[PDB]
């Protein structure tokens, strides 16, 4: 599976039906037959594979890192020192779009799960999406292709100094 | 006859077999439009009633 | 939305006056259906031109197949002149072409009755625009009358055909289509109508002349096209008066346009461009 | 890549010491070979290039356009026989060997640290194409399309070299690296946009633009097969590889002096895609096609959104892919017809039951069909334009329905309906011009399967 | 292959239309039509086929049976 | 006497070229497919562990399919 | 605009306006009883003056009934559908196969159909084994400075076949 | 209809208009009346996932059919007098939109005519 | 047997296809028959269409 | 009975009714007897070309080609530049461009004032 | 020269309408049958025009006195229960409730 | 349950066979419309399944595999949907279509380039129902232009009359 | 899609439906018996009489073979030609 803090659900309902006919309910037949012919050799396919591959065993390992200062802490120039200090904002930049993506897929799964009932028991995860979002809107967004990591920080320079002036000259 | 539904489940095979696995382990992916409880049902898994409707007049 | 369809609806309603061949015919009928289905989006009904999409698909697959049978039976002769009578000969596909122009309009009251006056009852009852309810009943008159003239001028009148006949229904596989699908067009048009959670409110409550109106329209529309037979049955020859000529060249739009635009931008292209 | 640039060293003297009737298969088989070793690099991981000592590196800027040529030399070279075949055999060994020299330097254009090497090897590209059109062209005008395309590309592509010596002698260095790491903007003075004016206007010249495409046509109607394809593809998929190079640096005056361009590359795309409507010269009309995709394609490197380069390079190479098959049917109907116009070669249908299915897919690709790559290069450039000004969406669907309208008027004009009782010579199609054509396409739905690879570096 | 070709002066024209042609130009006073050829289409299994309502009303010579049978039942 | 002959252009040369190039994409399709169906049938893809107490394996072993 | 001259007459051109008015009147003029009315009177109407000796009348009666038909005609008329313009239209060019092809087949195809290729065969050297003499002295004799006509003469002279004959003879049979 | 006609031939002043209809208030002159049924259970009836404009009025019949429609499946045709119940109450409440139509055109019609009388 | 044409005669007419369609056609006369009578009263709407709302007064403080 | 059915440049005008076609003159007959002299010498030189067992291309029309070669390369000569011709060049060469350059000039000039206010639907507008 | 030369004259090509021996007019990439087909009209050319135009300027016409005179049935407005339907609009689900509720009639 | 996302994909999924099938033929079939009437009988029904099953609960759902191009804040997978009108949709349109591969079988009996022709239409059917299926709009994008693309072919099918391919 | 022809079947047609015609007459009714020349009628019935073959066969005849054939032999022999019927 996965970790169900990080990929939620609203907790399972199944309602029982009460035929009032006696037909009896064709879709049971049909149901028990498919269950019958196929779950049955399915499962037979999948557990011969599972000791097949439960036989011998290999791994593999999530790669982490280390952490460079900065790029404020490299000088004028400092070709070697920018160099780390500038693809570690890029692999920052990678998580962070699929961080965007993952909480579009939250998303998706309320509308999708919650049918016409949307406005209840939704607007939490709009809520924290236009949040989110606007967080990336103020920060990745207006920089342009040839991004290395210097017009980020030159946009951020900007933007606090523009809300520091402004909320000078109005306080 | 034979041919015709080994044509049939074969492919039913093969993709219930990719369904389940796969598809399963892939946390947001296949999602439902939950069924719709009512409030005079009940609860497969807790289990409990909704309290009913109230009353009716002119009906 | 239902201006657009409105438009649609009337053009090709007027558009099928004196076409005298079949598949243009149907072309510019179902085009006029397609304009009841933007009527339909015209008022915030999706359900409806869904359910109308169903009866109507069930519908025209059945006609055209009845159509191709019919053309295939005289050599692809393929139009109304020169095939005439058609009734008691081989009376299959003729009861195959009278159920199909029947459940057109919705003869009362079958699988075409429900999704379209449903349609135009919920068209009725609405903040409409005061034009486009006119124009779709004109225009579901005009249907009842080339309906009535396929009708008319494919089966009954006195036969008009050449000799050497090879008309043939030693067949097995055109009668079992035929026969699935005129069973499709008499019960599953009712049979999806009917158990649909319905996602709109039934309106059930109009007025003297807003419920039986529209097959007041299509019976007003059958007598009128039957007085146009009666008068075409003599033998005067007046003149085309313009409306009759409005009606031939599909109201000049695709003769004037395809003739103009292919003009214009290819006439630049030598002049500006390629010279 | 030096173990791509010495086996390439190591083919051209075995065509030369290759003995009678056995030059084909040496270097067919070897050039597989090569491209086999082309796919081994394919390994472009995650925040950098992947850099080779001072000379190399490589990106998904540089990598999907060196399979590409790799990939495509042995199809040049099976479409460049029988119109050489009765010729002498040191002379088709000279031939041979001038293509795999310039399949060497385009390499060494590809795989370009700086841009004064990339000019060395940009005109490099340049002087084999002059030899091999000028001498074969097979028409009146060899001479002519030989000239205007060695003057137009040294005319243009001049005063770049004294703007890199510029930039060389005021930042340092000229690696791609070191201008990712020591640039600054320059802002809107006279000599910036001089500068920029000169070094975006040899590319415009290579592209070609509107204002100087007249370059084009008669070098692909008076050209062989080989150099052809060779000159459309990789000559102007060469200089928008080398537009995205140079456009890291100098970013704040593009928004100044990037407003002409734009405007003459949207209103000659309309226009070229309304010339190839209707001109005669079944040849030409494809010439004029690539023309309009490479105005789009301009339009989409400089309106510079990530977006809007992702749909660059994926119409550079699918259009690279459809115009090279499509140069190649082209010379499979003169084969038959000797004729090179449009209206005399009829037909088709009855006759070659088949080789249709292939112009039918070609044109389908051309048409921006939806697997296609065209249609993903085409929609992301439709996508930053309309966020670029919200109204130039309607010189895009123009040119798109005209695109269809052309492409399909093609296929249906010679290819659809009626011999002309006259011609009485094709022959059924040969076995080789298949096999071009399924080694054009296949590696096209092959990769219209999985194709996250060839998106750019901004995946 | 024979076709038998059912003769000639069979017709012996007697067809209610052309009947009505020959009579008005006739006091037109010119006697002179085509003629003998489409009495083929005018007799027949032809000649009083069914009218305009008859064709789409002929529903109800079966129906009314059933319907006392689902009335009944 | 009824029937005739009807005149088509050519088979031979179609149907040889669409051979050679169904039984050469079957050629090396056959083993790579079968080779990798035995590849997820026996040896497995690997499990999602992690780094353990002071431990620095190679560059590969962080990935899923065994052939990657 | 015709093969044999180039005008036509004054009554050709009547009577091609005959054949045209009367196919529109059949066109207009459905159930047909009403249709053999309206004809006769058509008929009628040009036998209103049969005994036209002067020219200039009968020419501007025909300018008239040019005008007067015009007025009058009908926009689809029911063309046959076989004819050029109708629904057919060469509809079964499908598998109108040119047979000068049929020539280059594989020989075992050419193994499968061994009778009918002898045939054809001896039928090809037929036709260049009569070319030369024939055609060439009918093509140098009976031509005069210029040609002047489309309509050529047969090989009345001596022998063997007309000349001129191999693409309009062996032309596929209209229902492949 | 008619009054179409009357309100587009007449004047605009003593005709109302829809969509801008409560003009003259509620409580005008009442006898204290407002009960306003509501019989709706409104959190079990998004329990029940239903929809915009029928989260409304005369649903409490639709929950029972929804209810006997899905408990009793292979019934096309058994399911239909909980459905004219509904469609019952839906017609009540089509009177009572109607009442609010004609209300508001008679005390426009009445409130203006007497400020004419005294005017 | 197989088939055979005629000239300028009616033509022949196995009965398989009259019965199909007698069968058809009057099926369909019979459905729309039942449905007409048994379940609907579909044409006319099952409710009575309503004078103006009460033709009443004293309705909820008219002014007099 | 009508307006004599004027043509257009779209409208074809039938050889029906021209109505000068009725003024013939010896002249006239004498034009077409020559026209349809032309027809059948070139029409029997087809011929002659077009039956014989040895020939294998294609039938080498000359018309075609001269079609071509007069449609491609022979339109620079000839040329001149009158009034016409610079004038009709530039109003469809720039006339366009400077139109269409002059909306963008306003578009662009709306939309950076605009979101530079911030009166924009940029609450999100991701895909830069 | 493409709608008229009735096919029944038997030339040589079959489509093109042209006869091998002809000046081959300038626009022949572009007058052929199945690109443009300039037959003669059967009325006018200035009277369809007009008639179209006229026809599709009533059309609008009509449109906008259908646009400015709506028809409606007299009804009122509906009676949702929360308020004009609160908590499934937009939103704010426990900060602003505009208190209106209905009175009967 | 994940009998309903089985059964709705082995309805789309029973729409390729024939055409590899007559790709990867190399042995002349005859019985190819026997071949496509079986396989479009048993795809309906299996389609009249699952609309058994959604009238008998509701039960909408939503099916989505194999990504590419995740590249922005945006992805997209080859995903498509079944409400209620793709459920109660494509049933209509497969008994429409199976009916019209009897009328073909019986009309273009003489022609003997059928099987082209099935090719195309069935390609044509597999094309309209990825339409009427999907959910995420680029694919909505490729059912259009597909369907554009088969009614071009299937148009021009009679080459020649340049009425039709006009 | 398969009616057969002949052409003694053919010309029996052809025949037959001449002789149907009214104001001529089939005592002198043959299959060489000129129109114009020897049978009197004028070329206006003779276009009626190709009308008839048009109408009845079902495929346009050329206006420049409305001309010229004036004889049952020769429509019998154009009509197998248009529609290519032998063995
Ligand atoms: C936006 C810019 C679009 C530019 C389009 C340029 C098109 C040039 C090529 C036109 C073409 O393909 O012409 C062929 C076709 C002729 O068809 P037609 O003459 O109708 O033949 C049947 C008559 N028996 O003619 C056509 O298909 C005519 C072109 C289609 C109509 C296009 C515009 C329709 C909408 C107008 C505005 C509303």
Redesign the interface.
Same mark, same amino acid.
């Given at each position: 599976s996965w970790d169900k803090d990080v990929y939620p659900e609203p907790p399972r309902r199944t309602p029982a039906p009460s035929p009032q006919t006696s037909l009896p309910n064709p879709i049971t037949y049909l149901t028990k037959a498919f269950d019958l012919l196929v779950d049955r050799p399915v499962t037979l396919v999948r557990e011969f594979i599972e000791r097949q591959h439960a036989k011998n065993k290999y791994y593999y390992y999530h790669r982490e890192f280390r952490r460079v200062p900065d790029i404020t802490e490299c000088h004028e120039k400092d070709v070697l020192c920018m160099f780390e200090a500038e693809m570690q904002w890029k692999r920052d930049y990678k998580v962070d779009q699929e961080i965007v993506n993952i909480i579009q897929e939250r998303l998706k799964a309320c509308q999708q799960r919650e049918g016409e009932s949307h406005r209840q028991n939704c607007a939490k995860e709009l809520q924290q999406f236009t949040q989110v979002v606007k967080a990336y809107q103020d920060r990745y967004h207006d920089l342009g292709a040839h991004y290395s990591a210097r017009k980020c920080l030159a946009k951020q320079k900007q933007r606090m100094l523009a809300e520091r002036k402004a909320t000078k000259e109005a306080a | 006859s034979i041919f015709a539904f080994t044509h049939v489940l074969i492919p039913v095979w093969i993709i219930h077999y990719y369904l389940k696995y796969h598809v399963t382990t892939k946390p947001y992916t296949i999602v439902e439009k939950k069924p719709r409880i009512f409030p005079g049902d009940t609860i497969l898994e807790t289990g409990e009633v909704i309290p009913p409707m109230k009353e009716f007049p002119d009906q | 939305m239902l201006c657009l369809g409105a438009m649609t609806t009337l053009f090709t309603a007027m558009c099928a006056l004196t076409q005298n061949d079949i598949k243009k015919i149907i072309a510019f009928s179902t085009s006029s259906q397609l304009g009841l289905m933007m009527v339909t989006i015209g008022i915030n009904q999706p359900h409806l031109a869904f359910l109308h999409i169903c009866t109507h698909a069930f519908f025209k697959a059945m006609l055209f197949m009845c159509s191709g049978s019919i053309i295939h039976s005289l050599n692809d002769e393929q139009d109304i002149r020169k095939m005439g009578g058609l009734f008691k000969a081989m009376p299959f596909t003729t009861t195959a072409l009278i159920i199909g122009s029947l459940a057109l309009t919705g003869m009362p009251f079958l699988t075409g009755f429900y999704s379209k006056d449903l349609i135009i009852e919920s068209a009725n009852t609405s903040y409409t625009n005061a034009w486009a309810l006119l124009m779709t009943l004109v225009a579901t008159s005009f249907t009842a009358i080339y309906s009535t003239r396929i009708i008319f001028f494919a089966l009954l009148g006195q036969p008009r055909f050449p000799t050497l006949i090879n008309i043939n229904e030693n067949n097995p596989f055109l009668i079992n289509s035929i026969k699935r699908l005129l069973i499709g067009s008499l019960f599953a048009g009712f049979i999806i109508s009917n158990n649909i959670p319905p996602m709109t409110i039934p309106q059930m409550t109009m007025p003297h002349y807003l419920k039986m109106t529209a097959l007041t329209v299509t019976i007003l529309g059958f007598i009128l096209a039957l007085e146009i037979s009666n008068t075409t049955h003599y033998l005067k020859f007046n003149y085309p008066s313009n409306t009759f000529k409005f009606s031939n060249l599909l109201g000049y739009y695709p003769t004037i346009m395809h003739r103009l635009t292919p003009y214009m931008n290819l006439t630049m292209s030598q002049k500006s461009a390629s010279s | 890549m030096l173990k791509y640039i010495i086996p390439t060293m190591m083919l051209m003297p075995l065509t030369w010491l290759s003995k009678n009737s056995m030059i084909w298969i040496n270097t067919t088989l070897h050039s597989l070979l090569i491209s086999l070793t082309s796919l081994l690099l394919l390994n472009q991981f995650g925040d950098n290039s992947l850099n080779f000592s001072l000379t190399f590196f490589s990106d998904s800027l540089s990598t999907p356009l060196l399979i590409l040529t790799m990939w495509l030399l042995p199809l040049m070279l099976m479409a460049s026989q029988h119109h050489l075949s009765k010729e002498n055999l040191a002379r088709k060994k000279l031939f041979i060997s001038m293509l795999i020299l310039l399949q060497l330097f385009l390499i060494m254009t590809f795989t370009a640290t700086e841009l004064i090497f990339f000019y060395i090897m940009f005109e490099a590209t340049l002087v084999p194409t002059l030899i091999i059109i000028t001498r074969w062209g097979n028409q009146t005008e060899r001479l002519n399309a030989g000239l205007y395309f060695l003057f137009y590309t040294l005319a243009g592509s001049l005063p770049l070299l004294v703007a890199l010596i510029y930039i060389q002698n005021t930042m340092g260095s000229l690696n791609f690296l070191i201008l990712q790491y020591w640039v600054q903007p320059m802002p809107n003075s006279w000599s910036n946009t001089f500068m920029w004016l000169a070094c975006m206007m040899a590319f415009m010249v290579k592209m070609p633009l509107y204002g100087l495409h007249l370059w084009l046509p008669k070098a692909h109607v008076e050209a062989p097969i080989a150099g052809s394809m060779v000159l459309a593809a990789i000559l102007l998929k060469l200089g928008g590889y080398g537009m995205m190079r140079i456009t890291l640096l100098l970013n704040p005056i593009t928004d100044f002096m990037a407003y002409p361009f734009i405007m003459l590359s949207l209103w000659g795309m309309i226009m070229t895609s309304s010339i190839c409507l209707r001109q005669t010269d079944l040849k030409s009309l494809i010439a004029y096609s690539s023309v309009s995709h490479m105005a789009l394609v301009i339009v989409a490197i400089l309106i510079q959104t990530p977006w809007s380069y992702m749909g660059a390079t994926a119409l550079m190479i699918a259009h690279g892919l459809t115009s090279s098959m499509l140069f190649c049917l082209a010379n499979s109907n003169y084969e038959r017809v000797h004729s090179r116009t449009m209206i005399l070669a009829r037909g088709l249908q009855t006759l070659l039951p088949l080789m249709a299915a292939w112009w039918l897919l070609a044109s389908l690709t051309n048409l921006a069909l939806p697997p296609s790559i065209n249609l993903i290069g085409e929609l992301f450039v439709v996508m930053s334009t309309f966020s670029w000004s919200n109204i130039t969406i309607i010189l895009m669907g123009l040119n798109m329905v005209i695109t269809a309208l052309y492409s399909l008027y093609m296929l249906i004009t010679t290819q659809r309906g009626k011999h002309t009782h006259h011609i009485n010579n094709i022959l059924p199609s040969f076995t080789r011009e298949n096999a071009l054509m399924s080694l054009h396409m296949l590696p096209l739905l092959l990769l219209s399967l999985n194709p996250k690879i060839i998106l750019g570096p901004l995946y | 292959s024979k076709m038998e070709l059912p003769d000639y002066k069979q017709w012996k024209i007697e067809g209610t239309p052309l009947e009505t042609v020959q009579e008005k130009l006739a006091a037109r006073g010119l006697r002179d039509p085509w003629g003998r050829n489409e009495a083929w289409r005018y007799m027949g299994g032809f000649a009083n086929n069914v009218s305009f309502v008859g064709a789409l009303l002929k529903g109800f010579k079966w129906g009314f049976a059933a319907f006392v049978v689902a009335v009944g039942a | 006497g009824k029937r005739l002959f009807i005149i088509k252009p050519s088979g031979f040369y179609d149907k040889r070229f669409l051979k050679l190039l169904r039984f050469y994409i079957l050629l090396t399709g056959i083993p790579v497919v079968i080779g990798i169906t035995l590849i997820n049938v026996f040896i497995g893809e690997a499990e999602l562990a992690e780094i353990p107490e002071g431990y620095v394996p190679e560059h590969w072993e962080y990935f899923k399919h065994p052939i990657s | 605009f015709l093969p044999s001259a180039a005008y036509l007459t004054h009554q050709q051109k009547v009577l091609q306006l005959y054949k045209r008015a009367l196919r529109h009147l059949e066109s207009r003029c459905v159930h047909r009883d009403k249709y053999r009315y309206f004809a006769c009177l058509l008929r009628a109407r040009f036998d209103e003056h049969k005994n036209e000796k002067d020219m200039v009348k009968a020419t501007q009666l025909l300018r008239e009934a040019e005008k007067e038909f015009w007025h009058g005609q009908h926009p689809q008329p029911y063309i046959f559908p076989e004819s050029p313009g109708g629904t057919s239209y060469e509809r079964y060019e499908c598998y109108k196969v040119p047979e000068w092809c049929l020539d280059d087949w594989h020989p075992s195809e050419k193994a499968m159909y061994p009778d009918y290729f002898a045939k054809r065969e001896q039928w090809k050297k037929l036709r260049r084994e009569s070319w030369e003499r024939e055609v060439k002295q009918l093509q140098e004799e009976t031509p005069v400075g210029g040609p002047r006509t489309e309509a050529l003469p047969p090989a009345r002279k001596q022998g063997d076949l007309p000349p001129l004959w191999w693409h309009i003879v062996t032309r596929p049979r209209e229902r492949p | 209809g008619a009054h179409l006609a009357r309100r587009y031939l007449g004047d605009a002043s003593v005709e109302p208009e829809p969509l801008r209809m409560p003009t003259f208030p509620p409580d005008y002159g009442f006898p204290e009346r407002k009960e306003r049924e509501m019989v709706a259970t409104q959190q079990e009836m998004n329990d029940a996932q239903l929809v915009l404009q029928q989260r409304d009025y005369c649903a409490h019949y639709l929950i029972r059919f929804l209810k006997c429609k899905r408990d009793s499946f292979p019934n096309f045709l058994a399911c239909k007098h909980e459905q004219h119940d509904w469609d019952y109450c839906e017609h009540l409440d089509y009177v009572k939109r109607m009442k609010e139509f004609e209300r508001e055109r008679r005390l426009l019609q009445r409130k203006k005519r007497r400020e004419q009388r005294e005017a | 047997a @197989? #088939?055979e =044409?005629?000239?300028?005669? +009616? =033509?022949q007419? *196995?009965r398989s296809?009259?019965i199909?369609? %007698?069968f +058809? &056609?009057? *099926?369909?006369? $019979?459905? #729309?028959?039942?449905? $007409?009578? @048994?379940d &609907?009263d579909?044409?006319?709407? @099952? +409710?009575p269409?309503?004078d =103006? &709302?009460?033709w009443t007064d004293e %309705?909820?403080? #008219? =002014?007099? | 009975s009508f307006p004599k059915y004027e043509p257009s440049r779209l409208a074809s005008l039938p050889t029906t009714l021209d109505p000068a076609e009725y003024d013939i003159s010896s002249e006239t007959r004498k034009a077409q007897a020559e026209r349809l002299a032309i027809r059948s010498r070139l029409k029997r030189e087809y011929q002659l070309q077009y039956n014989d067992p040895s020939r294998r291309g294609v039938v080498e029309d000359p018309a075609l080609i001269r079609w071509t070669c007069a449609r491609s390369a022979n339109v620079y000569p000839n040329f001149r530049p009158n009034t016409k011709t610079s004038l009709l060049g530039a109003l469809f060469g720039i006339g366009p461009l400077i139109f269409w350059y002059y909306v963008f000039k306003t578009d662009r000039d709306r939309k950076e004032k605009l979101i530079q206010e911030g009166k924009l639907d940029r609450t999100f507008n991701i895909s830069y | 020269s493409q709608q008229e030369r009735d096919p029944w004259y038997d030339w040589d090509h079959p489509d093109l309408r042209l006869n091998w021996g002809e000046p081959m007019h300038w626009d022949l990439d572009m007058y052929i049958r199945n690109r443009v087909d300039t037959s003669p009209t059967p009325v006018n050319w200035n009277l369809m025009c007009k008639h179209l135009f006229g026809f599709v300027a009533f059309m609008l016409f009509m449109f906008w006195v259908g646009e400015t005179y709506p028809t409606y049935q007299p009804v009122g407005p509906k009676q949702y229960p929360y308020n004009n339907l609160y908590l499934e609009r937009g939103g704010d689900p426990n900060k602003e409730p505009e208190p209106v509720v209905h009175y009967e009639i | 349950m994940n009998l309903f996302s089985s059964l709705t994909l082995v309805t789309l999924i029973l729409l390729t066979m024939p055409i590899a099938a007559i790709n990867f033929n190399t042995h002349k079939f005859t019985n190819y419309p026997l071949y496509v009437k079986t396989t479009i009988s048993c795809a309906f029904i299996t389609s009249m399944i699952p609309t058994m099953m959604f009238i008998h609960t509701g039960q909408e759902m939503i099916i989505s595999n194999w990504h590419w191009l995740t590249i922005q804040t945006l992805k997209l997978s080859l995903s498509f949907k079944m409400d209620f009108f793709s459920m109660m949709f494509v049933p209509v349109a497969l008994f429409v279509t199976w009916s019209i591969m009897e009328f073909s079988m019986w009309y273009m009996h003489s022609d003997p380039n059928i099987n082209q022709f099935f090719k195309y239409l069935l390609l044509f059917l597999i094309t309209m129902l990825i339409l009427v299926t999907a959910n995420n709009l680029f694919q909505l994008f490729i059912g259009w232009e597909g369907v554009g693309i088969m009614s071009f072919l299937l148009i021009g099918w009679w080459y020649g009359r340049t009425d039709a391919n006009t | 899609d398969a009616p057969p022809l002949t052409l003694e079947g053919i010309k029996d047609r052809v025949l037959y439906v001449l002789k149907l015609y009214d104001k001529i007459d089939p005592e002198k009714l043959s299959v060489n018996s000129h129109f114009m020349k020897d049978l009197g009628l004028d070329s206006l019935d003779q276009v009626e009489i190709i009308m008839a073959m048009e109408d009845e066969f079902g495929f346009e005849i050329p206006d420049i073979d409305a001309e010229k054939l004036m004889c049952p032999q020769e429509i019998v022999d154009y009509i197998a030609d248009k529609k290519d019927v032998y063995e």
């Open positions: - | - | - | - | - | - | - | - | @197989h #088939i =044409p005629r000239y300028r005669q +009616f =033509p007419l *196995t296809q009259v199909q369609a %007698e +058809f &056609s009057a *099926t369909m006369w $019979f459905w #729309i028959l039942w449905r $007409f009578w @048994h &609907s579909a044409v006319l709407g @099952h +409710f269409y309503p =103006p &709302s009460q %309705e909820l403080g #008219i =002014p007099p | - | - | - | -």
